[PDB]
Amino acid sequence: RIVLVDNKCKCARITSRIIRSSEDPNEDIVERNIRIIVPLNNRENISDPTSPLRTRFVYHLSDLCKKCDPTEVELDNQIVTATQSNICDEATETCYTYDRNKCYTAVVPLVYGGETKMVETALTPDACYPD
Amino acid sequence: CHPRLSLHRPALEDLLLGSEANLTCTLTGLRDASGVTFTWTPSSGKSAVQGPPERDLCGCYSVSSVLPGCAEPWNHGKTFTCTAAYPESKTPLTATLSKSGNTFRPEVHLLPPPSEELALNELVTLTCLARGFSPKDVLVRWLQGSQELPREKYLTWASRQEPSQGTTTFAVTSILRVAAEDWKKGDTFSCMVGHEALPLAFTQKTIDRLAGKTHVNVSVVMAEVDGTCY
Amino acid sequence: CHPRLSLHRPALEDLLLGSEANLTCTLTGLRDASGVTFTWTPSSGKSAVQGPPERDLCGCYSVSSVLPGCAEPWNHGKTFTCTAAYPESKTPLTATLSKSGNTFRPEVHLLPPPSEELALNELVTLTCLARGFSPKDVLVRWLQGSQELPREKYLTWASRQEPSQGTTTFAVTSILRVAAEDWKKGDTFSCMVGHEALPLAFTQKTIDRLAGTHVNVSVVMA
Amino acid sequence: CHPRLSLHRPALEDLLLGSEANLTCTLTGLRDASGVTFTWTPSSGKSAVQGPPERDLCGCYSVSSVLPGCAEPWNHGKTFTCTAAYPESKTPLTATLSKSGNTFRPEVHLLPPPSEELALNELVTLTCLARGFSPKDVLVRWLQGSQELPREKYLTWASRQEPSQGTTTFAVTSILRVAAEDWKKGDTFSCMVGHEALPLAFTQKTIDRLAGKPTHVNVSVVMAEVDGTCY
Amino acid sequence: CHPRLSLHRPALEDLLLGSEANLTCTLTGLRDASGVTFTWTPSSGKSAVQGPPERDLCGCYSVSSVLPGCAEPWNHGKTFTCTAAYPESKTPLTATLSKSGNTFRPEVHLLPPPSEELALNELVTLTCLARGFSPKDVLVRWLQGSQELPREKYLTWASRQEPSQGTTTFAVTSILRVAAEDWKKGDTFSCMVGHEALPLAFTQKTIDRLAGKPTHVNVSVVM
Amino acid sequence: SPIFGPEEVNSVEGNSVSITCYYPPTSVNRHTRKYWCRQGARGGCITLISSEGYVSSKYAGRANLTNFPENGTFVVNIAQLSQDDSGRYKCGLGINSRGLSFDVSLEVSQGPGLLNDTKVYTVDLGRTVTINCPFKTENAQKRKSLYKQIGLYPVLVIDSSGYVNPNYTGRIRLDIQGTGQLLFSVVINQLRLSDAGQYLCQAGDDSNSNKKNADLQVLKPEPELVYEDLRGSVTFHCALGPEVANVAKFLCRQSSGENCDVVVNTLGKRAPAFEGRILLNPQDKDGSFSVVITGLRKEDAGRYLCGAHSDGQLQEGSPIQAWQLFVNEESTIPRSPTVVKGVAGGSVAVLCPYNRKESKSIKYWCLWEGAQNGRCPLLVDSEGWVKAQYEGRLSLLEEPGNGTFTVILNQLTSRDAGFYWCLTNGDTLWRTTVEIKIIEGEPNLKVPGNVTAVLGETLKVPCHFPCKFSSYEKYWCKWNNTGCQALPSCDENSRLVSLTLNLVTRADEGWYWCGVKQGHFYGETAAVYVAVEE
Amino acid sequence: PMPFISAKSSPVIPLDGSVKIQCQAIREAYLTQLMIIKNSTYREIGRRLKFWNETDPEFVIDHMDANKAGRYQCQYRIGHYRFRYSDTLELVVTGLYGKPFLSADRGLVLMPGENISLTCSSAHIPFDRFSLAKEGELSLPQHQSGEHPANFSLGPVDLNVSGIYRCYGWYNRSPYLWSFPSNALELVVT
Amino acid sequence: PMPFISAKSSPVIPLDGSVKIQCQAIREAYLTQLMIIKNSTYREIGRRLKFWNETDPEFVIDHMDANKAGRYQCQYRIGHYRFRYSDTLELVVTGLYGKPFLSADRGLVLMPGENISLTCSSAHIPFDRFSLAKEGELSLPQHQSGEHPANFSLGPVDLNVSGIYRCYGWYNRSPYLWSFPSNALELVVT
Ligand SMILES: *[C@@H]1O[C@H](CO)[C@@H](O[C@@H]2O[C@H](CO)[C@@H](O)[C@H](O)[C@H]2NC(C)=O)[C@H](O)[C@H]1NC(C)=O
Ligand SMILES: *[C@@H]1O[C@H](CO)[C@@H](O[C@@H]2O[C@H](CO)[C@@H](O)[C@H](O)[C@H]2NC(C)=O)[C@H](O)[C@H]1NC(C)=O
Ligand SMILES: *[C@@H]1O[C@H](CO)[C@@H](O)[C@H](O)[C@H]1NC(C)=O
Ligand SMILES: *[C@@H]1O[C@H](CO)[C@@H](O)[C@H](O)[C@H]1NC(C)=O
């Protein structure tokens, strides 16, 4: 099962496989599985006050599979760096689930003594430790 | 009575919100006057002030000494020892301490108001529960949307050691009375809990009028499925 | 020290659950005069007894007087007057105490555990909140099914005055962490709050699973 | 015929693969002789290539000169002022050109083989359609796996401007034929499109039988009421 | 300048859409009088009048002869040789006219739009690929539904020769960009490719949304 | 997935056990809660102990979970085990319901006791064992035999008349030592796995029949868990006993069909897949050699059975030593190029990575060489030693200095291709293998040949470069034993970067370079020699 | 023997009107043209390029006038040079001359076994001929006369004869120019 | 009038035994104590704290001893001040004196209409009284004599009267301390 994409921030796992048959070589099987985890306890944006819950989740197969990381290709005698997709414009995508391996903080006003302080909280505490 | 000396750790508010947190050593049980001398292990700009004496229980002089600028060493873990020497003594009193080890991270929780409080439709009670941390020092705050609620509009209790199911752990609870019309309008209420062990020294849990549910329905489209994934 | 006289109401625990409820009149700061007279003008019912001195603030001969059998008069609503004296001045020390009115029953709410605790399959926290009672006193206790839990298996906070504007009311909170196996078995867990304003003197509320959910999902696939 | 001067932009293939930004300035219609002179404003390469007096149809004489260069001045927006002073003109003429502005990046599309072409199981066509790029020039190269194929195995069309949907844009196609066994086996074919407007000046799109239209899809939706991180 | 003779053929558009199949056997370059004489080996009796006497680029006189009264009824494959004359030296100029065989029928495929352009829900780019015809002559027309789109509604590249083994073949492509709403509604687009090798002189391929029947999408939901 | 621990742990009642589970040292993992649950019939982990201060009532006082971030592991020390602990626990991280766990089937069994009529004997597979059995003094010269109670009936395996069973040919001996001894010993060499069971003694067919039941059990090796990264390296310190210090050592690899697939023998054998990346160091006095396998991959994880045999193949009677390799696949090792194409006469510049913690160590560049069991000698070291044969045409610069160092090798030839390794002096050692393929073509940087100058004469030497390199910085870096250093300061145009030497002295003679670098990363280079004559 | 050409509207189209014409589609035709016969020659007015299998070639003519009236025919291109023709159709224009007068000698409720004759004529118009047109007919009327007292005999009428009838003038010099509609009569048969 | 109290185990119990005693649930009673009777005083022996509406409170006593035997009464608590009580049962100790001898004048197969009397006596014990217990009874036996030849008449026996009969000594000074079970008699009535 060759994994095609594991989009963490939208949390879609797309895998593919080929099932052949030793007869009539036109009924070949190409199977693609898309597993989607849909949160029911996450705000629309990643912020505290926002659209108390998100009820509409849209999953476009053309944005799950995007790869906005350059690769190296050797054409004739030289290696050249090349992108691999068009729709990865600089990021601003709004995806649903949290990234287990990435920080997600927030900033909140508070009062201390004779001053106001804009404290930084931790919406995902495990992944935010300065090491 | 018998003189007593103890080192009091800085208040958690100044630790998690204040740049500088002082460390104090308090003394009691004086005999006739206060001619005490206070010394500490470090001497990097320790411009400590002796201060004036006070009155203890049933009458007795008592003076305490404060060392400011004990934030960076506190993070590092330096040992702080306060030594007190009064004229009516032969061996000065010592009290040593250091930043506590074996810390744990609170498991903050928000609870929606009970259904039996929505029926009366006058005021609803929101509960915050910060549970399961080793050092008893915890901070609780509430917010309406993104704006902080006044410190007098919610009740926060004291940090108590919950029964030991492992290491010794501490729990705190707080409640807030909020308008039923405001609750139903669509405002979101947050509880921010602060601690030493927490990653960024703070965390928060937010709740709204839909959280805890019901018959909420959601839609997913999955536009193109046979769409040349690459 | 400084002389000081005070009178403390009977505890709610022994009044509601115990057999005999005391009534402590305490005098402190004397530091002498072991022959202190403790008498009450309501010289009726039971006979007042004395109490040995103890150390208070390292310099006070704290003396306490206790009057067993005070449950019935307390419920009736008698007014108690404690009297004492010291050899310093020519005036005695007198204090008064009576059961206050304007009592409001608590509004007991047993909240469910948060959903972020059932995933870890560890102890799940049930919280019980009692709100809106006038007298500072209150009992909170827990039951798992039909049996009480020893007071070391759960945590109860003190009763605190709930910041309000209309009237003075006090609220208390408790949490009991029950094994996730117990919570998922289907067992019922209840919190009893005892009070004097309640005509029944004890209100209990219960929660379990399957109390109070259903999500409909629409798929399109173009 | 008529003495006319023109300038040509540097060939893209010599600009993307390497850095040789060699220009071209062509004068056509020499009156009687080949007594022409050339001059560029940035006279750094004083040994400019003076092309031989080549002939053309209908008794036409042309002298095309090539200035060797590098991608640095060209991509930095340099100004070129090739001239000519053929005797038949009483006043020298000048030509000017430079890097084009307002460039849109191509939207490369690698399209799998058509549905009915796979039935024959003899050869399959892979199309690489660039689209929307404003400058006329673009490079299309093809790879089978990681080894680039020779330019003699695929057909690539010109860049003909597409009908004006507001602004002027171009588009090119490039078919590459593959043994059907290679496709049905599971090899991966890539199309590399190189255009000036792109950030890296290169992009690629890779397709294999797994990254095409699948005959069956099994989609499972999982709800996460507790917390959305999905380890 | 230098005189020369060239014989053309009618454009495929005229052959497949009208009766203006007028051959041409013209001369480029002329600096003498009108001493022109044209002869065609066919003697069908049609009109072979001289066309417009005009000039060409670079101050050259060009005389063109057409076949207005004949629509090229040479399905048998006539030689149709034309010879010109001039007052120049004693060497008349004759043209070469022959019919190339080995005609190959075009193979036309209509490619559904790329998914990325479907997602943006603005437009979709339907591509028509005509590959594998021996004569380098083909014309591509588009239809939306049943109405033939105007010639400014699409784009077409030239006809280029494709790499192969031994046999020679050409190819061409075209793109029709249509608003995403039109594609999603279900409106059926079509590509017509006209080539000589086809018995009916036109091949049609139709494409519309929901063209993939054999797909077996499966949706399951768990808790 | 990435969590690795003992796939099966064995122990006995009331005996402490320790389960080590490895995880990536990512900052998220080290601070994520580590649990140790026990899946049951309800399909849900019931966390039994966690790193967030929770110990179950049952595991209270008899267990503790301690997590070491530096190693990247956590240990679950469980005391006072019982047969009821036999089950499939799960290591892991974070929320139980997710899939970041590693199933661990811990099984325990009750020990013996109260049985004084039966003996026991446990020894490592393929070793030598002996059992001593007495016979009654009444039997002076009487038959002595060993009976094997196989199932329904017993069979003779050895007698006193020289009879030897076909199943024990040449590896079983009966011994009657002198000094007035009336006790017989049975010694078996090269123990197998087909001899476990109960044996009996017998002294003739007389009424004495001094029998004594005994038991024979063979213990397999315990896999020593190794948790390495993708494209990293593994080391096997095979230290078998001295008694097999002169036998042919082999390094098998188990599979599904329990069939060996030898990776590296001591008889000059080696699997094609592991070509050019596996060493075989010579054994020391006691036999302690190291087998290094670099260039780890997805399929290079499995059970390795390093042992000894006469022919070098796994067979019954061979002492072995098991292992278990787990390739992380969540590797933090940069995926540097594995193949470098060099142009004959041109040059390369290979960026060899290391760990940023050992930036102060010293580096090594090793030409891999086969033609033996395996070898890997140094060519250049960071301290300033350069091989004799590679003078002037090799350098190892610590210029990137942030987890990588460059190795520059110019004057490539057809004999300069092949695998190469990079080494350091640190503990966290990745032996990244890079292959140099030689391709025929014109070097980008033109060398001009090696030049001679007269004493005290200014010498000008230019080297031409493409203007694709015009963007890159251009340098010369006169070569020295410790390391070449760019000469102090030179191209008028897109080509011809020059060097000028005002005077020529005996110290100036030697090798010089000309090359390019992209700020801090180096590239193609060419080399020349400057000689002095009079 | 030939493809049929129908008109989706009545062949008597008034001035500044519209009409839709449908020809019998043949799949083997890749081009279909509408030809108007004038001066014994063809003239293309509508072209359709398609392989019709489900629908049929529908052409629309708007602003009906004398120039556009006449004989229409669909010409199909089969193969490289083959041509397949169809039947002819006629289109006329109404509203160029005055309305004649039409009457009947019966009560317009004649029994199915009765005979009714219609007289159409004009007094102030030199109309050479007259034509009786029944409303709703998609084909040109077959009832015409040559004399001034245009007589139309129906004989043994039946239910199919029921309908609305009108009369239109007809000039021999203007074959396809018809006059304004005359008074309408409902010749209901029951 | 008063809520009942019952024992789920047989009142007869040897040394080191256990018995479960059940009270009656009262809806408003927020406490249910199982009390003791000794010198007309109350000493807590059990306490169940719950508003009982679904099941009756039960109290289990183990390690039965001489001090534990006696009178048991169930006391509730209504409201803040109201007290209420329940019935009173008795539990006794057995097995501290010699086992008396029991005999039957009949054959132990007495018909349902016959009369059978049981004689319990001992020769080496000064037993003041004797008690005749029957197996299966959940409360104290109602048969007890005063003379050394303790006679217990059954009169018109029936099916319900059938069972196992035993005799136990009884001292006036120690009501809740009995002797070992006597020789069981299987009085079967058929
Ligand atoms: C761009 O055009 C220039 C025109 O001079 C080419 O430069 C010549 O390249 C050839 C290749 O061998 C050399 O022999 C000549 O000496 C070069 N000319 C000069 C003046 O040096 C250059 O090669 C062209 N670029 C490409 C990529 O073809
Ligand atoms: C470069 O000049 C030196 C001058 O000593 C020549 O010497 C040999 O260089 C090669 C390098 O490939 C060494 O392996 C030999 O050991 C050198 N010779 C001696 C005697 O040490 C060298 O031939 C010149 N390079 C050429 C001609 O390509
Ligand atoms: C520490 O002591 C200094 C000196 O009195 C004071 O200015 C400062 O506010 C103190 N900081 C604390 C108590 O955090
Ligand atoms: C009085 O207080 C003591 C100790 O708090 C308690 O044990 C006792 O039950 C109370 N009542 C009486 C009557 O002693």
Numbering used by the authors:
A (entry chain J): 5 to 94, 97 to 137
B (entry chain B): 242 to 454, 456 to 472
C (entry chain A): 242 to 453, 456 to 465
D (entry chain C): 242 to 472
E (entry chain D): 242 to 464
F (entry chain E): 2 to 490, 502 to 546
G (entry chain S), H (entry chain R): 6 to 195
Question: What does the published report state?
Answer:
The ectodomain of CD89 consists of two immunoglobulin-like domains (D1 and D2) arranged at an angle of approximately 90° to each other. Map quality and resolution were sufficient to refine the positions of main chain and side chain atoms for the residues at the interface, while density in the distal region of CD89, including the second Ig-like domain D2, was of lower resolution. The refined structure revealed a 2:1 CD89:SIgA binding stoichiometry verifying that two copies of CD89 can bind both mIgA and SIgA. The two copies of CD89 bound to SIgA are separated by 108 Å (distance between the two copies of D2 C-terminal residue T195) and relative to each other are oriented differently than the two CD89 bound to mIgA for which C-terminal residues are reportedly spaced by 124 Å. Alignment to the mIgA-CD89 structure revealed superimposable binding sites (RMSD = 1.165 at FcAB; RMSD = 1.121 at FcCD) on Cα2 and Cα32. Consistent with the mIgA-CD89 structure, the CD89 D1 BC loop, the D strand, the DE loop, and the FG loop (Ig-like domain nomenclature) contacted a total of 19 IgA residues, including three Cα2 residues and 16 Cα3 residues, burying a total of 1656 Å2. A comparison of the CD89 and M4 binding footprints on SIgA revealed five shared interface residues (E389, L441, F443, T444, Q445) located on the Cα3 domain. CD89 binds additional residues located toward and on Cα2, whereas M4 contacts only Cα3 and binds residues closer to the Tps and JC, including R346, T447, D449 from HC-A and S356, E357, A360 from HC-B. CD89 and M4’s distinct binding footprints and structures direct CD89 D2 C-terminal residues away from SIgA and direct the M4 fragment C-terminal residues (and likely the rest of the M4 coiled-coil), alongside FcAB in a line near parallel to Cα3.
